[PDB]
C-alpha cells in the first residue's frame, strides 16, 4: 500500500498552509525562495548534465579512440576485448551502485515521477544517494555503449535535485533554515518535482520549451499558470548553463567534450517543401510508427514481466542480467559491422567520407581507403553520434537496406533487453534509434521518388516511434524542434506524431501507463469510465467497511484504537455534527506532544498555538510506534477540533462515481467525505475511485 | 446579465450527454466527426487566412506601388492624396461594415473568446455575419496601413469558423444533419472554439505549437489531453494549407502575394553566442518591456474608457472616430519620414541599399541615389514588412536613434488610438512594432559594446513588450520561435519574457484582463483570494435571497411562477429529499411540450422518451414568452424528476468560499448547490464566487 499525498489546504490559520495568509515579510520570503529554488534547480541540473555529458563523452570517446587504435592496426580481436571489457566494467560499476546502494535509480524514474505528481507517495525515489547513483550510473551505462540514454535519467536527477533543494539537503543531513519551512507542503513539493522534471527533459535534449511541455503533457497531473513560469525559468537556466558549457570547452579545454554544436542532432540545412507525392510515405511512417510502437510496448511489457522474475530472485542476478545484456550489446555492436560490405565513397556527398576516429559520419572500420562501413557508422559509435549519422543532411543512399535492417533488428532487440536492467536506463534514445532505422529505411526505399531527405525521414520515423510508444503529441514536437532545428519539418512531424498516437492507441496504452500498471502504482486517470455515471458513491460505500470516525474531544484510548487497529490516514471528526477530517499525522502529533486534557473541554485557540507551531504541524517526523501512552493517560482527553480540516470536500450519497472521480482529480484530493443527501456515511480515497478496484467489487458494470 | 454556459453533464441516459454511453455506431460517428471538424477548422482557417493575406498584400502592395510611383516622380503632394484617400476608403469600408452590420467584430475578439472559454455566454460573438465582417474588415484595415494586424482578428475568425462548422452553418441557415447532434453541447462547443482559436493564432504567425500554447495558456480555462490532440491537428492543417499557398503563388501567380518565405519575419542567419557583457542590456530590455507594457496597459485602459464614451454616442461617431484615426495614421506615416535625413548606403551591409518598391529594406523615398530614408523603411510600408526591416540580420546601425525615437513615439500613439476603434483591430502587431522600436534603439545605443545583433535585440524588445502587456511566457516564446526561426535566441527570449512579466505584474493586470474588466464580462480566475478561506458559503448565502426551489412533481402554476418572476437559470428539485437541479431550459421545454399530468404521479421512463428525444433536450430553441398556458392547465402537474440533474455538485454549509471557487472552476460548474452539514439551503453561481461581488456584500474582508 503506497499512500497518497496531501495537497489539500487546511484553511485554519494555525496551520498556515496558504502562503498569502502569512506576514508581509513571509510572502516576500516565499516568493524570493521559490524563484531562487527555480533558478537553483536550473543551475544544478545544467551543471550536473554538463558533468554527465563531459564524463560520458570523455570515457566513451577515449574508449572508442582506443578501440579504433586497435582497429586501425588490423587487430580486430584485441579491439573486441577492449570494447567488451570497458563496457562490462562500466556496466559493473553502474550495477553494483544500483543494486547494492540505490535500487530506485534503476530505470528512468519517469513512471514514478508521473506517479508522484499524480499524488502517490512513491518511497525512496527522490534522495541524495538515489541521485548520486543515477549520476554515476548514467555515466557508466551511457559510456558502456548500451541501448539507453542519459535523457530519462536526467528527468529523475533533476527532480532529485529539486527535492533536495526544497527540503534543504539529504535526509538527516538537512540544514535547519527557517526560510525552507514553506516548502514542507506536499503541494509545494509537487511544484518543485514538476520544475525539476521539466529541467531534466530540458537537460536531456537542450530543449527548454519541450521540457515545460513534457511536464505539462506527461508527468504533472495538476497545472497552474504560476508553476509554468517557474518551470519556464528552470528550463531557461538549464539550457543557458548547458550552452555556456558548450561555449567553454570549444577549443578542447575539457577533453573530448564540446566538439559539437549547441544544438543536439542539428539537421537544419535542408529545404522541406511539401509535395503531394510524399503524402503516402509520411502516413506510412506514421502507421508503422504506431504499429511498431504498439509492438514495442507489448514486448517491453512482457520483457519487464520476465525481468521482474529476475529482480525478485536476488541482487547478484540483476548484476548478471545486466552484465549479460552488456556483453551481448558489445559483441553485437562490434561483430555485426563485419557483416556489412564496404560501400565506396560517394563524390556527390559533400563532406569527408574516408573518416576514422571516435565520432563523425562515414566510418572506415574494416574497409580499404576510399570505402566506408555503413553499419559501424551506427553500431561502433556512441548512441548519440549514431543518431546524427542517420539524421544526416544531404547524404542520399548512404546506408544500404541490409545494414539498416541489421541496425533496426539489433536496436529492436537491444531496445527490449537494455531497458529493464538495473542500470539507469531510459526510453528516449532507444526509441529514437529504432525510429531512425526504419525512417531512413523508408527514405531509402523511395529511391528518387521523394524530395524529403532520408535524414529528415529519419526524424519523422523517430518521432513516430516516440508517438507510437509514449502517445504524446505536443511535447515531442517541441523536443524534436529543439533537437533538429527544422521549423518546416514541424507540421510533417505533427502529422506523423498524430497518426502514430492514433494507430498506437488502437492496440496498447502508453509506455508510461504500462510501467505504472507493472509497478502497481495507483494512478488516477483524467476522464472517468462511462459505467461510473451509473454507479453511485452511496452504493460504492455499501460495498466497503463502515467509517472509523472520531469525536471532537476524543479520549486518548479511542485515538490509539484508530491508530493501532486501522491503517487509514484520515478520520472524520464528529459530535450529530460533522466537523471535518483530522489526519493520522496530527493524531500522532497530539499523542507525541501529550496535549492531554483531564475533562471534555473544547479548548481556546491560545492553548493550541502554545503547543503547536506551524512548523510543528508540517513536519512528518513522527512515528506512531514510539509513543508509550500510560493507561492513566488513556482516560484523558484530546481536543481534535483545532487540528481538523474543518472544510473538507464532500459529495452527497446520491453523487455518481464519475463526478466524484472528477472532483477527486481536479482539486487534488486524498480523502473525499460522503455526507447524506450520522452526518458522515462514507469516505472515498484514491483506491475507491480507481476503476479496477470498482470492477472487483462490481463485476456487473462494463 | 450575461449567462454562463452549461458544461455539466446530466448523467441520466435520457439526455445522452456522455458520448461514450451512446451506440457503437454513434461513438464512431462522434469520433469521426470531431476529427473531421478539427481538420475542417484547420482547412477553413488556413484558406481564409490565405485569402486574407492575398487580399492584404495585393491591395496594400498596389497602393504602395501607386504611392511610390507618385513619390519617384517627385510629386509628394499627390502621393499623399493617394495614400490618405486609399487608407480612408479602406477604413470607411471596414467601419460601415462593423458599425452597421456586425459590431462584435470590432476589436480582436480574444477578450471574449477567453470569456467564452471560461464559460460566459457572450452573445453575437461567433456568427456568420460577424465572421464575414471581420474577414473584409481585416482586409480593409490592415491594407489601410493602420496600427493593427490581422493576427488577433484571425483568432476570432477561426473560432467563428469553428462554431459555424459545429452547429452546421449560419443561424436559421443550418443544415439538419443528424450527425451534428452531438456537438450541440456547450462542452463540445468549448472544444470547437478552443481548436478554432488555436488555429487562429496559428494562422496569425504561421505558428502551429504557439497556437496550441496560446489556447492553453490564455484563452482556454479547461484543458483535456483529448482536446490538445485535435487542437494540435487543427494547427497542423492550418500551417500546411498556409505554406502550400506560399509554395503556390511563388512565381507571381497570385499578384503581389507570396513574394516572401514560408517563415514570417525569419531572422535565422545569425549566431547567438551568450556573453557576460550582454547580461545588462538584456535585462534592461526586460525591465523596460515590463515598464512600457504596464504603461501601455494603463493608457489603453484610459483610451478605451474614452472610446466607450464615443461608442455609446452613436454609430456615425464610431465611423468618424476611426476615419479620424486613419487620417492621422496616414498623414503621420507619410509626412514624418521627411523629418529623417537620408543616411548614405553602407558598403559593409550585404544586400541592396538603393531599394525602391513596395517592400524590402533600405527605402529610397525622398533621397538621392546611394542614400536611403530609414524612417520610410518603417512608416511607408506595410506593418508586417516594417517588422522585418527592424528585425534585419547583419545591418549594423541601419536606423538612427532619432528615426527610431520618431517611430517609437508614433507607434506608441498609434498603438493607443487604433486599438479601440471599430475596425477589426488587434494587439499582436502594434506591441511587436513598439517593442521592435525600443529593442533596436537599445541595440543601437550599445554601439560595438555588444555581440547580439540589433535585429535580434529587436526580437527581445518585441517579446518583452508582448510579455509586459499580455503577461504570457510559454505561448509567445513558441510564437517568436516559429516567427523568427532562432533556436539559440530562445533562452534569451525566455529571460526577457519572464523579466517583463514579473516587472509588468508589479503595476497592472494583463491586457486581456483589462478589457475583460472593461467589457463587464464576469471572468473567474484560478487561484482564490486569501480572505475567501475565512468566509464560509453558508455566510455567503445568508447575504443572498432565499432559494427558489421546485418539487419533483410540481404544478404548472408554480413552474410559471419560477419562470416569470425569477431570472434564475436552475432550480433545486425537492420533496425532505433533494433530487437535484432542473434547468430553466428544461422547464420551458416541458411547458412547450405540454407534458401535463392530471394527478401527482411520478411517471415511468417510457413516458418521457415518447415526449423527449435526446436531440429535443439539447436544443435551446425555446422562448418562454410564446407559451400561452391556459388556467385549466395550470392546475395540472409536470413530473420534473426525469429532467433533473440528479447528481449535481454540492458543497456543505461549512465549506469556505475559496474551496468552493476551486471546485466551481475546476470541474466547470454553473450552479453549485449548498446542502446543510430543507435539504438545500443555498445555490452558488459564478456571480457569488467572483471576488468583487463578495467585497460588495462583505466590505470587512481584505
Ligand atoms: N477514516 C476512515 N474510515 C473508514 N474508512 C476509511 C477511512 N479512510 C479511508 N478509508 C477507506 O479504507 C480503504 C483503505 O484506504 P486507506 O486505508 O488506504 O486510506 P488512506 O491510507 O487514508 O488513503 P490513501 O492511502 O489513499 O492516502 C479505502 O477504501 C478508504 O475508502
Ligand atoms: N434557483 C435559484 N434560486 C435562488 N437563487 C438562485 C437560483 N439560481 C441562482 N440563484 C442566485 O441568484 C443570483 C443571480 O444569479 P442568476 O439569476 O444569474 O442565476 P443564473 O442565471 O442561473 O446563473 P448564471 O447567470 O451564472 O448562469 C445569484 O447570486 C445566484 O446565487
Ligand atoms: Mg493507507
Ligand atoms: Mg441569469
Numbering used by the authors:
A (entry chain B), B (entry chain A): 53 to 627, 635 to 736, 743 to 767
Can you list sentences taken from the study reporting this PDB entry?
pmcMembers of the chloride channel (CLC) family play an important role in anion transport in bacteria, animals, and plants. CLC protein forms a homodimer in which each protomer contains its own ion transport pathway, in which three anion-binding sites were identified.
The structure of AtCLCa was determined to a resolution of 2.8 Å, allowing confident model building of most of the protein regions. Similar to the structures of other CLC proteins, AtCLCa forms a homodimer displaying C2 symmetry. In AtCLCa, nitrate is similarly coordinated by the side chain of Tyr564 and backbone nitrogen atoms from the N-terminal end of helix αN, but a hydrogen bond cannot be formed between the anion and the side chain of Pro160, which likely explains the weakened chloride preference. Additionally, the side chains of Phe471, Phe480, and Tyr564 around the central binding site exhibit noticeable outward shifts relative to the anion, which seems to be structural rearrangement to accommodate the larger nitrate. Mg2+-bound endogenous ATP can be modeled in a large nonprotein density located at the interface of the N-terminus and the two CBS domains.
